[PDB]
């Protein structure tokens, strides 16, 4: 993925191969390019911030790098050749002989008109400088002055995208015209409003994040990386979620890959027997204390590792507001599009 | 992004008072005391110590929303006795207990090092 | 992708032990559970960190950021 | 048709919010506005708001004169210079306890478009009480809802006296409540009121403090000796108002159940 | 910080003595002599203030005024001790020459003052201006001097001038001033207000938010102006003339 | 001519002020009204500066000495007032002043904000002042943004004959309370020109520096 | 500005008491260093 | 031609706010043309 | 400055020169990172 | 010996782990002590990086985040100052530490970039601080990155002082075990069983330190929680006994701040 200048790309920092793998995966190569992480999950009620598919997450886990993803974007441009004269040039525009300049900061551009790798671009900055010569007989209905011999054709960044320019490429196309491609990098961190899913149709959003002190803990000082609600189990009858939890816990405690292929001889009682060899309550329950006051909890809690995947929907890509702004040419009504700040 | 800065958990803003005391209008000899930039660590300790005074009737605390670091404490004591005095006695007792605990731990650790 | 320096759950450090952990697997021909316990990994969350790690840094390293095809 | 002064974002659950109150992110509150009229009762706060500027919440973003001219506060250095008069308008940010209209698509019935009171919060999600998710047919696995801001006094009064969440509890399709205790609060209010459940002193004190309508009186326990204890029914009775009477006889229940 | 509400005008010296009689007939108070010396300081051009937020214009550079009172013993020459110290001496102050020269003022080197351009709009009947003021009481150190202080802040001297005139105190805090202004340079002293007196009537308001007081002040100023109809025409000066920012240079005199 | 000295203790405890108040209780003659003090530092935001030109400017605000601010830079002092009762009558009369000035801190932090910007702020409130035999001692706890900073002691006397003996006595009194790391100062800004409040502000600056 | 007859009687009693106290304190000072700082929690038994 | 009726400065200094659909004088902050 | 895409040869190109490598003759050229590291604040 | 106060019995100790019993104490006090031991003890960690050359296969903020978690010696952290209080511009000599990292892959075989290669170039003024924490046998410590032939990395690091309430990197304690009442004499937990609850639930190691209850004894309805069993492990920066002592000191200072503010407010009320 390092070279390719795709329109969009997402990469995960640390991927983990699942603790419970089907035998067929050895042909899809899912243990070479995983798509999630093993998260400790405690199924419980705790403070009422995980109801109706929400979840609660440990903030220290976030801070140490769990579910952190790189993001990569790219843009392209090329010089156009109208007629026989080159009507577009790659050069840093100057306000002396240019009209209709954009409010973005042209300062970061080099003399070539192309920004250089390693510069923190931001909202509405420009990364490619493009100037269009205009024939003298063409006047913008009195807008043009005597010295405005050229027009601006630069490409500003999308209004929200921020980050660091990562690569710049110069080539030529079939017609011999110049060709520039810019690739930009960014980092994405989970936050209230993201989207996560398990392998059994159980997906939700983060509803609040807690620090390790307010997290309920076991007698051994272990803390759940996340907490889900038990009101999601009955009507969905996802017993495979519970079985996967139990088997993954046994494999983590033991240290060997646990088969979970369909139509085989593994049973629940067998893995419960293998669990009790290690020293835990056979049905996966455990004793946990309250994080605030330190007391004991009346009811025990189902506890163990699972596999989760970070889906493609972030709240930063869905948030939009508008007081006023551009209209439409024909109907004169607010435009369509979030990237074009419409209604 | 709308994520507030983390240092707002332990640095008071300018014009902020660490304590705010307000008389309670329902029960006689009752005060509501707001603490800023603090969480259960202090409120639980202070309430558990205030429950040991035979002249203290009521002592309860709460943290209304887990976004903001602040909490409320409520005290009610017997006639002829000031809730602020009760708070002062509780803090003194806590400090003495912690000092004794530190001395004991240091003695035990040094004894272990001698036995190490 | 190089091994995480710290454990996401209990705050412990596992980053330095990866090199020595790989040694026990083929030089001493031990099993995974005993090798994991030989390095003081006792909570199963640390065992989770070390056990399920996909080391992708040895593939990018045979490669350059210039000229991938499709 | 498309409109102005509106936002769209995912939702989440907040058990600490009141029934008819919505958590609005900070930036969305910094973008939308409201045209407040300068009067003798507000000129001090409005002056401080203008001095604050557009990069700070609370603040302001535009000032409209009597003649219709509008001054952008950002370019005009006159955040500390403009003197306000009677009849001018300050386009201020949206402040706590401002009515808004809130809905989810598709809007099949009357109860899918309701009014709310704002509370400005960090982070990027909307906040709702966990009992209004039934009229909206909405959960928190990725649903986005829409927010519309009124821009006048008559419109604000209409949103506050007609479409408010409190007034939409007895639905007229089937003349029965459309909201109630749901999910885990319902699972808990049942484990609390069994005959088995007894409560000690400290927890009773904290629980009685949590009820914001308490009157400072401690209920006399039910087991005075040899140890004071409280029954869950007793503590839960504090929430229920006074003067409420209810009788329900199930199968095979006598006057001593 | 005050909101100063002002009206301006000018008169020829020929009517000067008759004007002074009429004022005495209205106010009931006599004139009181006064003088002052103002020095204008501007930000140092050697220092590049990149902190001016060019993309937002949060602030623009401005000029600082330092004022001080100077005793009349520096303004009276050897021909004038015989006359008593009162308003009549102004009748002899018609020449561009003055006893106070450049060297004495250089030897001198208070009230520190900053202002802004008056409020915009054409529905204003009096010049409303905002003033921020402070006072310097004393100093010490190895370089205790006004010049060293203003160079420490980051300002340098631009010019200076001397005002001499009379004051009338009327009711409601209204102050009326008759002035003569002498610009001073090493090249010499030149009277800008040549052959005339500059008239300025003004009131101060302590709080800009109070609007009942501002309305009362405007009522008093317009009543005063309507009293002097036919004798002297009091007018609102040009809004672009009372602008004292460094970027653009002009000086109402 | 009165003399003054300032001693700052960095490693003090919250209760050290009470310890020093009680350890001196035998000689305490009376007690007076509480006092307060403010201490700001302003920084130069311009980069084209000479090497020999300092970058900081210390502003000390005295609340008990009639609400007066003192600006200090490179051993140069400046004293500004903001009360209408401290105005010399000539400036009011001639028209050089509108009569209701502002504190210089507002001027620095409102109009000149593109040359000077605030960097820190150290405050002291609810101090105690005690009259001993021919002496006045003021104590206060210093609070920064983070929290408690240290203890501040300022001594003022009218007769300068035995000032050093009193300073030594107070140092010994701190010595029995085992406060061994204390920085004291009684320097004078100008050997020939003696201004009391300027010298006090300079002593505060010399004591509070890190 | 006194409000109650008991308040008035207490005021007169305090008047006599502190008048005597002032007289004797002046007698001591005209010859003695009193202390105006010391406050004892419990009055000394007679 | 578009000029500020209060600054009266030639040539006029003007900035267009595209995201708000406004044309704003860069000196007095006055809004010239909307939408 | 620029850099080749196969051999990563160090080249300098003007505003009129052909966009090619001198040694390998390829038509793909990459830039060079800003030699002077520039400090920034994320806002 | 202080017989009126909390009692302590250390059973086990090492460079990393302390294992002990805390008796004659409330439950609130022990809980607050553990909360402070995890969250509110200062330490020294890298807080800013600036990079000169990066010819690796990883990103820049990737390596920055990796560097921000490496542990460094912070024994004398009481003599540094919060960078928001020091009068210096940017970073002080009294309110920061500075290190440099340089590496180049000259050899054909890939070369690992560990944390033993961080070199300190600032002035320490005779304080024991800034040294990297090394706990493995070979001494290499935290491995940071990987290099090939013809790849170089050059960067500079600024490390500062803070707490764990703002980032997980400043925390000195890994995980602390907190147990009490292994026989459930007080009836604080209610067990979940299929046939026999007394057999399905295993027994804690701590049962040997109390005597089992007898079936003939009625439920004791007057006891309170008094004995706690704790175990504390350190990341490595601070010695563990210092972790406990500094937690106690921090709790004391917080209560003393409350006391001082209350006394100030009472003096204000006097006015």
UniProtKB/Swiss-Prot annotation, chain E:
Keywords: Activator, Nucleus, Transcription, Transcription regulation
Single annotated GO MF: RNA polymerase II core promoter sequence-specific DNA binding
A GO BP entry: transcription open complex formation at RNA polymerase II promoter
UniProt subcellular location: Nucleus
Miscellaneous comment text of the record: Present with 1011 molecules/cell in log phase SD medium.
Protein family: Belongs to the Mediator complex subunit 18 family.
Subunit structure comment from the entry: Component of the Mediator complex, which is composed of at least 21 subunits that form three structurally distinct submodules. The Mediator head module contains MED6, MED8, MED11, SRB4/MED17, SRB5/MED18, ROX3/MED19, SRB2/MED20 and SRB6/MED22, the middle module contains MED1, MED4, NUT1/MED5, MED7, CSE2/MED9, NUT2/MED10, SRB7/MED21 and SOH1/MED31, and the tail module contains MED2, PGD1/MED3, RGR1/MED14, GAL11/MED15 and SIN4/MED16. The head and the middle modules interact directly with RNA polymerase II, whereas the elongated tail module interacts with gene-specific regulatory proteins.
Protein name per UniProt: Mediator of RNA polymerase II transcription subunit 18
Organism: Saccharomyces cerevisiae (strain ATCC 204508 / S288c)
Curated annotation (Swiss-Prot), chain G:
Subcellular compartments: Nucleus
Quaternary structure and partners: Component of the Mediator complex, which is composed of at least 21 subunits that form three structurally distinct submodules. The Mediator head module contains MED6, MED8, MED11, SRB4/MED17, SRB5/MED18, ROX3/MED19, SRB2/MED20 and SRB6/MED22, the middle module contains MED1, MED4, NUT1/MED5, MED7, CSE2/MED9, NUT2/MED10, SRB7/MED21 and SOH1/MED31, and the tail module contains MED2, PGD1/MED3, RGR1/MED14, GAL11/MED15 and SIN4/MED16. The head and the middle modules interact directly with RNA polymerase II, whereas the elongated tail module interacts with gene-specific regulatory proteins.
Family membership noted in the UniProt record: Belongs to the Mediator complex subunit 14 family.
Note: Present with 319 molecules/cell in log phase SD medium.
Protein name as annotated: Mediator of RNA polymerase II transcription subunit 14
Species for this entry: Saccharomyces cerevisiae (strain ATCC 204508 / S288c) (Baker's yeast)
Classification lineage: Eukaryota, Fungi, Dikarya, Ascomycota, Saccharomycotina
Residues of the whole record sequence present: 542 to 588 of 1082
UniProtKB/Swiss-Prot annotation, chain I:
Signal peptide per UniProt: none
GO cellular component: cytoplasm; nucleolus; nucleoplasm; nucleus; peroxisome; RNA polymerase I complex; RNA polymerase II, core complex; RNA polymerase III complex
Annotated keywords: DNA-directed RNA polymerase, Metal-binding, Nucleus, Peroxisome, Ribosome biogenesis, Transcription, Zinc, Zinc-finger
Any one biological process term the GO annotation gives: transcription initiation at RNA polymerase III promoter
Post-translational changes noted in the entry: The N-terminus is blocked.
Gene Ontology molecular function: DNA binding; DNA-directed RNA polymerase activity; zinc ion binding
UniProt superkingdom: Eukaryota
Record: residues binding Zn(2+): 4, 7, 21, 24
Key word Hydrolase present: no
ZnF (C4-type) intervals: 4-24
Places the protein is found: Nucleus, Nucleolus; Peroxisome
Subunit structure and binding partners: Component of the RNA polymerase I (Pol I), RNA polymerase II (Pol II) and RNA polymerase III (Pol III) complexes. Component of the RNA polymerase I (Pol I) complex consisting of 14 subunits: RPA135, RPA190, RPC40, RPA14, RPB5, RPO26, RPA43, RPB8, RPA12, RPB10, RPC19, RPC10, RPA49 and RPA34. The complex is composed of a horseshoe-shaped core containing ten subunits (RPA135, RPA190, RPB5, RPO26, RPB8, RPB10, RPC10, RPA12, RPC19 and RPC40) where RPA135 and RPA190 form the DNA-binding cleft.
Note: Present with 907 molecules/cell in log phase SD medium.
Family: Belongs to the archaeal Rpo12/eukaryotic RPC10 RNA polymerase subunit family.
Name of this chain's protein: DNA-directed RNA polymerases I, II, and III subunit RPABC4
Gene symbol of the encoding locus: RPC10
Curated annotation (Swiss-Prot), chain J:
Organism: Saccharomyces cerevisiae (strain ATCC 204508 / S288c) (Baker's yeast)
Organism lineage string: Eukaryota, Fungi, Dikarya, Ascomycota, Saccharomycotina
Family annotation (Pfam families): RNA_pol_A_bac (PF01000), RNA_pol_L (PF01193)
Name the UniProt record assigns to this protein: DNA-directed RNA polymerase II subunit RPB3
GO CC terms of this entry: nucleoplasm; nucleus; RNA polymerase II, core complex
Compartments where located: Nucleus
Result after altering residue 9 to E: Transcript termination readthrough
Modified residues (N-acetylserine): 2
GO biological process: RNA-templated transcription; termination of RNA polymerase II transcription; transcription by RNA polymerase II; transcription elongation by RNA polymerase II; transcription initiation at RNA polymerase II promoter
Family matches, as NCBIfam families: PRK00783.1 (NF001988)
Gene3D superfamilies: DNA-directed RNA polymerase, insert domain, RNA polymerase, RBP11-like subunit
Gene expressing this chain: RPB3
């Amino acid at each position: 993925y390092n070279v390719r200048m795709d329109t969009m790309a997402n990469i995960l920092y640390y991927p983990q191969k699942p603790l419970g793998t089907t035998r067929a995966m050895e042909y899809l190569k899912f243990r070479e390019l995983p798509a999630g992480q093993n998260a400790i999950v405690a199924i419980a009620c705790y403070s009422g911030y995980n109801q109706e598919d929400s979840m609660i997450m440990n903030q220290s886990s976030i801070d140490r790098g769990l579910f952190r993803s790189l993001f990569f974007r790219s843009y392209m441009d090329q010089e156009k050749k109208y007629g026989m004269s080159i009507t577009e040039t790659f050069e840093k525009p100057q306000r002396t002989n240019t009209l209709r300049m954009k409010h973005g900061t042209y300062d970061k551009l080099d003399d070539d008109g192309l920004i250089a790798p390693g510069v923190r671009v931001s909202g509405e900055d420009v990364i490619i400088g493009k100037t269009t010569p205009i024939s003298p007989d063409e006047e913008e209905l009195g807008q043009r002055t005597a010295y405005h011999s050229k027009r601006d054709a630069s490409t500003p960044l999308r209004s929200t995208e921020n980050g660091i320019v990562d690569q710049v490429l110069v080539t030529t196309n079939q017609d011999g015209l110049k060709f520039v491609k810019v690739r930009v990098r960014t980092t994405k961190i989970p936050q209230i409003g993201d989207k996560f899913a398990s392998r059994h149709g159980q997906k939700g959003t983060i509803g609040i994040t807690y620090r390790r002190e307010d997290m309920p803990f076991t007698a051994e000082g272990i803390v759940p990386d996340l907490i889900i609600n038990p009101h999601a189990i009955p009507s969905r009858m996802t017993v495979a979620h519970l079985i996967e939890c139990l088997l993954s816990k046994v494999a983590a405690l033991s240290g060997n890959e646990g088969d979970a292929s369909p139509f085989t001889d593994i049973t629940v009682e067998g893995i419960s027997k293998l669990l009790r060899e290690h020293g835990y309550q056979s049905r996966g329950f455990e004793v946990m204390y309250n994080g605030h006051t330190g007391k004991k909890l009346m009811a025990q809690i189902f506890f163990g590792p699972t596999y989760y995947q970070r889906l493609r929907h972030m709240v930063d890509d869905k948030i939009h507001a508008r007081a006023r702004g551009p209209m439409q040419v024909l109907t004169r009504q607010p435009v369509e599009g979030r990237s074009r700040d419409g209604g | 992004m709308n994520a507030p800065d983390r240092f707002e958990l332990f640095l008071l803003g300018e014009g902020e008072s660490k304590l705010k005391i307000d008389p309670d209008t329902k029960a006689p000899n009752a005060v509501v005391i707001t603490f800023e930039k603090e969480d259960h660590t202090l409120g639980n300790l202070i309430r558990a110590e205030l429950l040991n005074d035979r002249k203290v009737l009521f002592a309860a605390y709460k943290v209304e929303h887990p976004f903001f670091a602040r909490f409320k404490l409520r005290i009610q004591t017997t006639e002829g006795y000031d809730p602020k005095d009760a708070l002062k006695n509780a803090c003194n007792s806590i400090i003495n207990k912690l000092g004794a605990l530190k001395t004991n731990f240091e003695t035990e650790w040094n004894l272990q090092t001698l036995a190490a | 992708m190089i091994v995480p320096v710290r454990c996401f759950s209990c705050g412990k450090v596992v980053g330095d032990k990866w090199e020595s952990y790989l040694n026990l697997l083929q030089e001493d021909e031990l099993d995974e559970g005993t090798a994991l316990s030989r390095l003081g990994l006792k909570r199963y969350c640390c065992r989770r960190m070390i056990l399920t790690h996909v080391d992708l840094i040895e593939k990018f390293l045979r490669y350059n950021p210039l000229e991938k095809r499709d | 048709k498309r409109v102005d002064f509106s936002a769209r974002t995912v939702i989440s659950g907040d058990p600490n919010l009141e029934l008819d109150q919505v958590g609005v992110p900070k930036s969305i509150a910094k973008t939308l506005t409201y045209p407040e009229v300068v009067t003798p009762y507000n000129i001090d706060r409005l002056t401080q708001l203008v001095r604050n500027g557009p990069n700070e919440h609370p603040g302001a973003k535009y000032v409209i004169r009597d003649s219709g001219d509008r001054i952008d506060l950002r370019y005009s250095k006159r955040a500390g210079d403009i003197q306000l008069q009677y009849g001018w308008k300050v386009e201020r940010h949206i402040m706590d306890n401002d009515p808004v209209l809130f809905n989810r698509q598709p809007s099949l019935h009357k109860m899918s478009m309701m009014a709310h009171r704002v509370k400005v919060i960090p982070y990027s999600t909307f906040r709702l009480n966990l009992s209004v998710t039934s009229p909206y047919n909405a959960d928190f696995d990725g649903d986005e809802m829409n927010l519309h801001v009124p821009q006048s006094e008559e419109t604000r009064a209409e949103l506050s006296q007609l479409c408010a969440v409190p007034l939409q509890i007895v639905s007229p399709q089937s003349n029965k409540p459309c909201m109630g205790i749901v999910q885990d609060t319902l699972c808990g209010i049942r484990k609390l009121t069994l005959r088995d459940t007894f409560i000690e002193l400290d927890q009773v004190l904290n629980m009685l403090y949590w009820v914001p309508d308490w009157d400072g009186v401690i209920p006399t326990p039910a087991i005075i000796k040899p140890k004071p204890l409280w029954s869950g029914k007793q503590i839960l009775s504090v929430a229920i108002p006074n003067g409420i009477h209810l009788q329900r006889f199930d199968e095979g229940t006598t006057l001593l159940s | 910080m005050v909101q100063q509400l002002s009206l301006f005008g000018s008169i020829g010296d020929d009517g000067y003595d008759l004007l002074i009689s009429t004022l005495t007939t209205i106010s009931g108070n006599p004139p009181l002599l006064y003088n002052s010396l103002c020095t204008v300081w501007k930000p140092n051009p050697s220092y590049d203030v990149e902190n001016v937020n060019s993309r937002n214009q949060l602030v623009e550079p401005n000029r600082i005024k330092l004022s001080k009172e100077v005793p009349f013993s520096y303004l009276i020459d050897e021909t004038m001790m015989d006359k008593p110290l009162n308003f009549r001496i102004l009748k002899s102050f018609t020449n561009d020459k003055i006893p106070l020269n450049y060297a004495m003022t250089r030897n001198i080197l208070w009230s520190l003052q900053i202002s802004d351009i008056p409020a915009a709009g054409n529905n204003r009947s009096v010049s409303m201006q905002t003033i921020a003021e402070t006072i310097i009481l004393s100093s010490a150190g190895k370089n205790s001097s006004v010049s060293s202080l203003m160079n420490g802040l980051g300002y340098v001297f631009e010019f200076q001038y001397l005002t001499i005139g009379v004051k009338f105190f009327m009711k409601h805090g209204l102050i009326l001033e008759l002035q003569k202004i002498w610009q001073i340079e090493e090249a010499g002293n030149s009277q800008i207000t040549s052959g005339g007196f500059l008239l300025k009537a003004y009131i101060n308001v302590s709080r800009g938010t109070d609007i009942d007081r501002i309305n009362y002040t405007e009522t008093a100023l317009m009543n005063l102006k309507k009293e002097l109809q036919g004798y002297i025409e009091l007018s609102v000066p040009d809004r672009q003339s009372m602008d004292s920012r460094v970027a653009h240079g002009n000086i109402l005199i | 001519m009165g003399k003054s000295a300032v001693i700052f203790v960095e490693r003090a405890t919250p209760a050290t002020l009470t310890e020093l108040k009680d350890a001196l209780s035998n000689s305490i003659l009376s007690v007076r009204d509480p006092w307060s003090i403010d201490f700001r530092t302003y920084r130069c935001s311009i980069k084209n500066l000479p090497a020999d030109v300092s970058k900081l400017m210390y502003s000390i605000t005295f609340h008990h000495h009639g609400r007066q601010t003192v600006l200090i830079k490179d051993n140069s002092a400046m004293v500004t007032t903001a009360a209408a009762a401290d105005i010399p009558p000539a400036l009011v009369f001639n028209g050089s002043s509108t009569g209701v000035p502002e504190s210089i801190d507002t001027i620095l932090s409102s109009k000149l904000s593109n040359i000077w910007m605030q960097r820190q702020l150290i405050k002291g409130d609810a101090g105690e002042t005690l009259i001993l035999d021919g002496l006045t001692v003021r104590l206060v706890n210093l609070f920064s943004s983070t929290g408690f900073k240290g203890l501040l002691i300022e001594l003022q006397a009218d007769e300068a004959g035995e000032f050093e003996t009193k300073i030594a006595g107070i140092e010994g009194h701190l010595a029995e309370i085992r406060a061994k790391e204390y920085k004291t100062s009684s320097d004078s800004l100008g050997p020939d020109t003696s201004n009391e409040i300027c010298d006090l502000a300079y002593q505060y600056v010399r004591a509070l520096e890190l | 500005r006194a409000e109650g007859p008991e308040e008035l009687a207490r005021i007169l009693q305090q008047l006599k008491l502190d008048k005597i106290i002032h007289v004797l304190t002046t007698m001591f000072e005209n010859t003695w260093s009193c202390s105006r700082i010391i406050k004892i929690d419990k009055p000394i038994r007679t | 031609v578009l000029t500020c009726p209060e600054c009266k400065v030639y040539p006029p200094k003007i900035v267009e706010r595209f995201s708000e659909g406004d044309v704003v004088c860069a000196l007095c902050g006055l809004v010239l043309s909307d939408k | 400055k620029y850099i080749c895409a196969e051999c990563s040869s160090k080249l300098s190109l003007s505003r009129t020169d052909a966009v090619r490598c001198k040694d390998c003759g390829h038509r793909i050229l990459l830039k060079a990172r800003t030699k002077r590291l520039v400090q920034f604040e994320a806002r | 010996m202080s017989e009126e106060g909390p009692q302590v019995k250390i059973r086990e100790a090492s460079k990393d782990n302390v294992d002990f019993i805390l008796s004659n104490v409330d439950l609130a006090m022990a809980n607050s002590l553990r909360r402070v031991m995890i969250a509110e003890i200062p330490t020294l960690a890298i807080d800013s990086v600036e990079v000169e050359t990066n010819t690796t296969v990883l990103a820049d903020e990737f390596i920055a985040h990796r560097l921000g978690l490496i542990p460094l010696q912070s024994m004398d952290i009481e003599q540094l100052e919060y960078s928001r209080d020091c009068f210096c511009e940017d970073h002080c000599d009294k309110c920061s530490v500075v290190l440099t990292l340089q590496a180049f892959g000259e050899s054909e075989s890939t070369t690992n970039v560990y944390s033993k290669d961080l070199v300190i170039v600032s002035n320490l003024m005779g304080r024991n601080i800034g040294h990297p924490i090394i706990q493995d046998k070979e001494g290499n410590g935290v491995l940071i990155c990987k290099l090939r032939k013809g790849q170089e990395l050059k960067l500079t690091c600024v490390a500062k002082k803070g707490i764990a309430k703002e980032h997980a990197k400043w925390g000195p304690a890994a995980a602390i075990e907190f147990e009490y009442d292994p026989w459930n004499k007080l009836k604080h937990t209610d067990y979940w069983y299929e046939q026999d609850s007394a057999k399905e639930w295993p027994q804690s190691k701590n049962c040997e330190y109390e005597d089992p209850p007898n079936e003939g004894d009625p439920f004791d309805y007057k006891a309170q929680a008094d004995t706690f069993y704790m175990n504390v492990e350190s990341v490595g920066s601070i010695p563990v006994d210092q972790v406990v002592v500094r937690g106690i000191d921090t709790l004391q200072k917080k209560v003393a701040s409350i006391l001082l503010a209350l006394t100030q407010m009472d003096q204000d009320k006097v006015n």
